């Protein structure tokens, strides 16, 4: 009724909406996020849009911290995958919850935006895959399926 692969496909759709609407709120603009094509309005698109709004205030308070640490991290095309996986693993080491799932979407957004601002174009799909595959391989996609799929993320907050 809700396989891990189904959640993975939904995650890509949720994340694209998350990226577009989160960037639209915060707006130098990232044209890759301004022009990111999205599927027709759907429940999955609605989740990503709602998850973007609920972080509007909080994200600004954390900008200075994440942006300073990403500058110190100096993520690149060669090390982005390793760094994402280690950071995401530590985040979920003590358990899975909706806040950490949303935080993972947010880190993917921040990581993709940071590398673009430093010249790494055409990498947004790579970061999307990082997010999707990490969830799939680290039991997060299954966790969402156990909660009924991404529809359970609707109206959080």
């Amino acid at each position: 009724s809700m396989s891990e692969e189904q959640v993975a496909q939904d995650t890509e759709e949720v994340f694209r909406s998350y990226v577009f609407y989160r960037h639209q709120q915060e707006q130098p603009a990232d044209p890759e996020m301004v022009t990111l094509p999205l599927q027709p309005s759907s429940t999955m698109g609605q989740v990503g849009r709602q998850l973007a709004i609920i972080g509007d205030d909080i994200n600004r308070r954390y900008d200075s911290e994440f942006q300073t640490m990403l500058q110190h991290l100096q993520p690149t095309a060669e090390n982005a995958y390793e760094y994402f996986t280690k950071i995401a693993t530590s985040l979920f080491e003590s358990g899975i919850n909706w806040g950490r799932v949303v935080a993972l979407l947010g880190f993917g957004y921040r990581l993709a935006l940071h590398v673009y601002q430093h010249g790494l174009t055409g990498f947004l799909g790579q970061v999307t895959r990082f997010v999707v595959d990490f969830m799939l391989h680290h039991s997060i996609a299954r966790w969402i399926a156990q909660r009924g799929g991404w529809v359970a993320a609707l109206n959080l907050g």
């Binding site: 909080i58 640490m69 947010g106």
Partner: peptide, 22 residues
């Protein structure tokens, strides 16, 4: 760590999000 400190910030972010979710 830098990587662990980033994961720490993400847990703290997740904590504030969870508070709003409940």
């Amino acid at each position: 760590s830098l990587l662990e400190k980033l994961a720490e910030e993400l847990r703290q972010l997740a904590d504030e999000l969870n508070k709003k979710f409940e």
